[PDB]
């Protein structure tokens, strides 16, 4: 069992506000098959999905000087099923005009996804769904979008105020601040890890892997599969603008994955620092090709 550092010394989780009416945004965008989107290149040789699900990350409430409580949606109450898998699309509508969610508008920026994959799911003591039992595999972006951590461990909820096993609990979220956690040269790689440790305690960690990612503004696709050997990660290093997945890591996960969870995110910023963020899409990998080599696909039905 690896060592992951200490745990949070805070005695009360930060307050979280949940809203849906201000978060139910209609941005209809289907998927076109002949776009080289979410197509995993065959492995070992050289020669597939729909509106989908949308997830929004927004900065928390704030005043003129000091930021207020967080602001998330009910992206943790809903729990979905892994089945064969799903395809991940990030950085869709950047470089354009978007509202700050919280009339005001700005340029849309890019965000990175965090996942929690496990086999047994229930609900908390309060009666709210989103609790994962036994081992869980968590993929957490770190370093203000310049690092990815992937660990395998059990999660124990905490009994402080606003924490999952405490009083007056709405949801658990990740947060970070741009003034301190992100800086030129002096980037903090353990911000979101500390935000995660604020709510849950990580016990019996079999493995913890790190991958370094360069900053960009490129629309991206991602995927994860499981076979008899282990969990295969399908991204960047070989293809960057064509959107063709490739393998970069194998994770020793032998239990069957049946459910996955998305973790909401927020940035502690004041009104003058509000920047709009990009919607993050996930499409079901229902089991159902023109080459250039890279593929540049038509639905049979």
């Amino acid at each position: 069992y690896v060592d992951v550092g200490p745990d949070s010394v805070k005695s009360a989780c930060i307050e979280v506000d949940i809203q849906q009416t201000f978060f139910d945004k209609t941005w209809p965008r289907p998927i076109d098959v002949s776009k080289a989107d979410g197509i995993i290149y065959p492995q070992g040789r050289t020669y597939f999905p729909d509106h989908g699900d949308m997830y929004v990350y927004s900065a928390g409430h704030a005043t003129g000087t000091t930021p207020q409580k967080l602001f998330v949606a009910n992206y943790s109450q809903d729990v979905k099923q892994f089945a064969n898998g799903f395809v991940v699309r990030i950085g869709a509508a950047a470089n354009s005009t978007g509202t700050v969610i919280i009339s005001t508008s700005a340029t849309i920026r890019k965000i990175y996804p965090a996942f929690m994959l496990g086999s047994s799911v229930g609900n908390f003591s309060d009666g709210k769904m989103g609790r994962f039992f036994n081992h869980t595999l968590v993929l957490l972006p770190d370093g203000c979008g310049t690092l990815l951590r992937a660990f395998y461990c059990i999660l124990e909820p905490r009994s402080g105020n606003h924490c999952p096993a405490g009083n007056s609990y709405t949801s658990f979220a990740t947060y970070h601040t741009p003034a301190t956690d992100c800086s030129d040269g002096n980037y903090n790689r353990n911000a979101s890890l500390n935000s995660f440790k604020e709510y849950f305690n990580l016990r019996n960690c079999t493995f913890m892997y790190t991958y370094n990612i360069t900053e960009d503004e490129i629309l991206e696709w991602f995927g994860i599969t499981q076979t008899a050997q282990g969990v295969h990660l399908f991204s960047r290093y070989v293809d960057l603008y064509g959107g063709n997945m490739f393998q970069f890591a194998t994770l020793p996960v032998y239990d069957t994955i049946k459910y996955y969870s998305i973790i909401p995110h927020s940035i502690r910023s004041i009104q003058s620092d509000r920047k709009a963020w990009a919607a993050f899409y996930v499409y079901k990998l229902q089991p159902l090709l023109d080459f250039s080599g890279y593929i540049r696909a038509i639905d049979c039905g």
Partner: antibody, heavy 115, light 108 residues
Framework: VQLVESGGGLIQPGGSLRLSCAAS????????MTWVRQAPGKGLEWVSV???????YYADSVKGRFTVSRDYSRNTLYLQMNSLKAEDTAVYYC??????????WGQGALVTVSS | EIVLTQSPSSLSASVGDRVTITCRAS??????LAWYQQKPGQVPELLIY???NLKPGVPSRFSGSASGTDFTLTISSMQPEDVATYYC?????????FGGGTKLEIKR
Amino acid sequence: VQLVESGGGLIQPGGSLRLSCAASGFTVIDYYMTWVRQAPGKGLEWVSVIYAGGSTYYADSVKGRFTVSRDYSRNTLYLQMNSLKAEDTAVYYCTRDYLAAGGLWGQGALVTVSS
Amino acid sequence: EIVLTQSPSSLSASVGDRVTITCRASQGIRNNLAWYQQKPGQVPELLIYGASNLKPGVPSRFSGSASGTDFTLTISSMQPEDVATYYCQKYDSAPLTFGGGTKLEIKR
């Protein structure tokens, strides 16, 4: 990390006052902070709490007279007292969140309400 | 409303004894009970968080105990130094109510 307080002295009854607590080594917005008073020769008492997210909770014996806030730019914690009476004469402290509520503690400021 | 009754309010100790204090409450507070130590003439300090966990600053002699309904703050051995006033607090919810502080002494 340290906390230094100021703003205490003799005050006539029926008048206001302010207490300021300056924090070094961290930022105020990270952790919740608590104002706690202690009467001379009596026990400890909890005056107010401010949580990350601007949610403030006051005690019943001080409700309607005291107010707690904080300033981000100066990294300060403020407590304003109005309609003071002779009962509100005590040593006050500002405390920072840690393993427990009172992990860091402060130095103390004496407030005397008399004519 | 949850009330925190710290007993005994005055503690008499000898050259040989193990401090044992209790903190009765009228409701459920999860385990969010904090035990503080105040040397008279100085600001108090934290002893134990969660009624069973130890602060890294404090040593391992002052060992907490379980909390069924009452909360026991045990101490392995009695020393001339440990003379202070020990306080309870419930940081479980909005009213963080205190109680009475128990003065310790050394036999002579």
